[PDB]
């Protein structure tokens, strides 16, 4: 193998890392193999893949299981104080499986978010374009784009012998000059692996947020009219009819800005002229002359909020220190003091990103009430 000279041979080598990080990788392994296996069992065997989102959710759990296969290799790697005994081939596969799982999982969530926008907002116009053949071709492209993105993890990842400490590690060697490694390999994980897909995921669920709000606020405007019409019928003085007719005019204009609504608002304005002059009987008749169980979930906005923030806060620690790794590689910063805090937090950020990512096929599954039903029958 190659012999290299580490600039900061003590960066990241901490005893609390050699104990806590391998233990965390074991927790991610047990929880990941447990959760993602049940998602495959419920979807592929109890549901037979009948929707587009089921194809994405199945491959989202399959790609996570492939990452967890190499996770014990990194657990004992960190346990032996960053010593790689599995040879050069097994690291080109293990380092690629980490990079392949990042792009694949984030691409699948992007298309799953786009599918949720089309299904909720345009159910009739996007039904014929969202088929099973499109869902499978989308996944094989996601595999290729992820493999094309994890290609440098197979070409340049090598086993290097460190002359400073006689320790055999596997790594990217950020050579000072004449390095065959691309300069901004960490920038690709920033924009293609986080920035661009998150902006598509955030946009998709923001459009769903606005669409459901327009529908829910419209239903609230009709409920305000009918409830106030019942208040007018049970009113006894001019104040009760004036307060209810004022709420109806305001609700009618709210419902209009969502087209004979001006005809209704004009008649409410006529009923207001009667209630203001002390005519209580004449105002009740006007509202009586002019004028059912839709499904609704007022907690869907909390779910949309949780989906977006769970993707952001799980990857934003890993992507920031990945971007900090690019600055050290480009020469913007060469201090070994900041290389230590970057090399220590990087296993921490991996424990946060890939533990939340291996719970995504399970969390997205529990959103489907049919999936939640088969899941609890397996545990019962």
């Amino acid at each position: 193998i190659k012999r290299i000279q580490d600039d900061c041979p003590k960066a990241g080598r901490h005893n609390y890392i050699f104990v806590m990080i391998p233990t965390l990788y074991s927790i991610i392994f047990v929880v990941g193999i447990f959760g993602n296996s049940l998602v495959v069992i419920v979807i592929y065997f109890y549901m037979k893949l009948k929707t587009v989102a089921s194809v994405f959710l199945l491959n989202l759990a399959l790609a996570d299981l492939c990452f967890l296969l190499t996770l014990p290799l990194w657990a004992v790697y960190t346990a032996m104080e960053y010593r790689w005994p599995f040879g050069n081939y097994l690291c080109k596969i293990a380092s690629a499986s980490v990079s392949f799982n990042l792009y694949a999982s984030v691409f699948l969530l992007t298309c799953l978010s786009i599918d949720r926008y089309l299904a909720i907002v345009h159910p009739m116009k996007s039904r014929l374009r969202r088929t099973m053949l499109v869902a499978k071709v989308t996944c094989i492209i996601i595999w290729l784009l992820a493999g094309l993105a994890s290609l440098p993890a197979i070409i340049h990842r090598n086993v290097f012998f460190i002359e400073n400490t006689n320790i055999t590690v596997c790594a990217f060697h950020y050579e000072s000059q004449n390095s065959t490694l691309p300069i901004g390999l960490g920038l690709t994980k920033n924009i293609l692996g986080f920035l661009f897909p998150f902006l598509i995921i955030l946009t998709s669920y923001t459009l769903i947020w606005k669409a459901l709000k327009k529908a829910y606020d419209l239903e609230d405007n009709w409920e305000t009219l009918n409830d106030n019409l019942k208040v007018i019928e049970k009113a006894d003085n001019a104040a009760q009819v004036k307060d209810a007719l004022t709420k109806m005019r305001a609700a009618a204009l709210d419902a209009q800005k969502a087209h004979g609504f001006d005809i209704l608002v004009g008649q409410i304005d006529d009923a207001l002229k009667l209630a203001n002059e002390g005519k209580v009987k004449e105002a009740q008749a006007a509202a009586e002359q002019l004028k059912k169980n839709k499904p609704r979930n007022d907690d869907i906005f909390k779910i949309i909020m949780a989906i977006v923030l769970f993707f952001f806060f799980s990857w934003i620690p890993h992507q920031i220190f990945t971007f900090l790794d690019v600055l050290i590689q480009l020469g913007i910063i060469r201090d070994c003091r900041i290389a230590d805090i970057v090399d220590t937090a990087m296993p921490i950020t991996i424990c946060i990103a890939y533990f939340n990512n291996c719970l995504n096929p399970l969390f997205y599954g529990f959103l489907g009430k049919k999936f939640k039903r088969y899941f609890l029958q397996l545990l019962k």
Partner: nanobody
Amino acid sequence: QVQLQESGGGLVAAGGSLRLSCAASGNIFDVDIMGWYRQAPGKERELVASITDGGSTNYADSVKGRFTISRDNAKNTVYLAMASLKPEDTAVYYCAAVAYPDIPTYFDYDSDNFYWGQGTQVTVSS
């Protein structure tokens, strides 16, 4: 399940009229959006018309001005009043409907909250 029964198909001469019906049965709650699809022989399926619970309709360019889709939210039935039928309209017309469960999460890995019908044949001869 949300079943869809369609009726009204038949062989009519060119330029005639027809009225397709499709009532939704087996739904505890109201259907959200319903519409009609047709599949010509040898050609892919297309969306003819759709109408929401509010009354907004979206017609295809090949049937705009001729077909008039309507519905009755009380009975959860959609009506496709076809007029000036052309031999190009000879296809199997399918009924579609979107129905969400109680407290909907808008995630369905079983049917995508989308339900179809059996299909009624509509033939227009010269």
